[PDB]
Design a binder for this molecule. Structure first.
Ligand SMILES: CCc1cc([Si](C)(C)c2ccc(OCC(O)(CC)CC)c(CC)c2)ccc1OC[C@@H](O)CCC(=O)O
Lengths: 11, 240
């Protein structure tokens, strides 16, 4: 769940 | 004999790859510099290289038709589990069989077995890694087969933690169908069948390389002086 940088690059 | 839909898939993947791969290697001057010497002297440079590549893998995966229509959780699971495999596939573009090395425009940015050693890895990873790179290079893949293989690798329904495995499989099956048809357009049987079988085996090889890299990464990153040398993105994507 805890993946802000990955999520940001996924948008 | 590619359908319009299959051509459409290939066109999207070629576009996605060309947007996320720069063959001049210009950004390599922005990493921490290589040092060939102190243990793990190549870990800062190679961590920056891997971190940069993870960003490219994410950019490519988000263009795979259907990928962004999965849940965010499944997208995250698929990228965390496939990132290292796609990096190994993508690296094959700059691999040369003269000297078992990766050339990226300059002598500073030419990587051999020793540089990977100086990032902390042992021969139980490096030997099968070189064997994989050699076997993949000798396939002489077209760029179309290359991008399809990377996409097939990413949308693997048997990754641990995937919830909508059937939806992931639906995407992969369409990619696999497109790859098989592309091969048949270029090669009559039985060369068609033999090439596809060798591509399947390379996907199986990548899973073994994944497992071994995970073992060695967990052993390396467990030491805080080693984790200090990584990047935030590497810690997030490769972590837990
Ligand atoms: C230069 C060609 C090339 C070679 C390699 Si590598 C086979 C010499 C290598 C090095 C370190 C490493 O991991 C080190 C750790 O395990 C994790 C940090 C240490 C804890 C691994 C994984 C086993 C592989 C990788 C990427 C690459 O090119 C990327 C491409 O993206 C550039 C073009 C673009 O995208 O624009």
């Amino acid at each position: 769940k805890n993946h802000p940088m990955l999520m940001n690059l996924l948008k | 004999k590619l359908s319009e839909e299959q051509q459409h898939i290939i066109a999207i993947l070629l576009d996605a790859h060309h947007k996320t791969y720069d063959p001049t290697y210009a950004d390599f001057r922005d990493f921490r510099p290589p040092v060939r010497m102190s243990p793990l002297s190549m870990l800062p440079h190679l961590a920056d290289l891997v971190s940069y590549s993870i960003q490219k893998v994410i950019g490519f995966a988000k263009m795979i038709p259907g990928f962004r229509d999965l849940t965010s959780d499944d997208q995250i699971v698929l990228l965390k589990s496939s990132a290292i495999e796609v990096i190994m596939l993508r690296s094959n573009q700059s691999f040369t069989m003269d000297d078992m090395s990766w050339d990226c425009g300059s002598q500073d940015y030419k990587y051999d077995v020793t540089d990977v050693s100086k990032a902390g890895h042992t021969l139980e990873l490096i030997e099968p890694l070189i064997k994989f790179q050699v076997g993949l290079k000798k396939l002489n893949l077209h760029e179309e087969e290359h991008v399809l293989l990377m996409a097939i690798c990413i949308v693997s329904p048997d990754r641990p933690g995937v919830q909508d495995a059937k939806l992931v499989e639906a995407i992969q099956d369409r990619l696999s169908n497109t790859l098989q048809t592309y091969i048949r357009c270029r090669h009559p049987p039985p060369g068609s069948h033999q090439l596809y079988a060798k591509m399947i085996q390379k996907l199986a090889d990548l899973r073994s390389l994944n497992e071994e890299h995970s073992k060695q990464y967990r052993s390396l990153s467990f030491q805080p002086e080693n984790s200090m040398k990584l990047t935030p993105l590497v810690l997030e994507v490769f972590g837990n």
